[PDB]
Design a protein around this ligand. Sequence first.
Ligand SMILES: N#Cc1cc(Br)ccc1O
Length: 119
Amino acid sequence: YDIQAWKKQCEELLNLIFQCEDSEPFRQPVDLLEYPDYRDIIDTPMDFATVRETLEAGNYESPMELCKDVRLIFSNSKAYTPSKRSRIYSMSLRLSAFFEEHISSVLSDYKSALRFHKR
Ligand SMILES: N#Cc1cc(Br)ccc1O
């Protein structure tokens, strides 16, 4: 019932995501020089370095907030892709499946810890 355990669990999951080749297009903000119309479609850019920095600065209160930012990386990729068959979008789908498979226990354990704290 450790209410703080999610933070190191998220740090370790972000480390795995950074080791994965599929994360390369998402490790840093999208390059506006390569994609000059990016901000005409995407209102809120997000990337894994920003997620990691926000976590390390102590600026997430819960793993749900981290999960909302990670999911924004994937929805941005889906909204900017010109095709559902594109390379970068295809990498986003595999990364998303891996992230969701691993974040599920983090969220469940945190929510269970909070419910126990308030019993
Ligand atoms: N992150 C990540 C990831 C992990 C495995 Br296993 C396979 C594909 C991926 O995109």
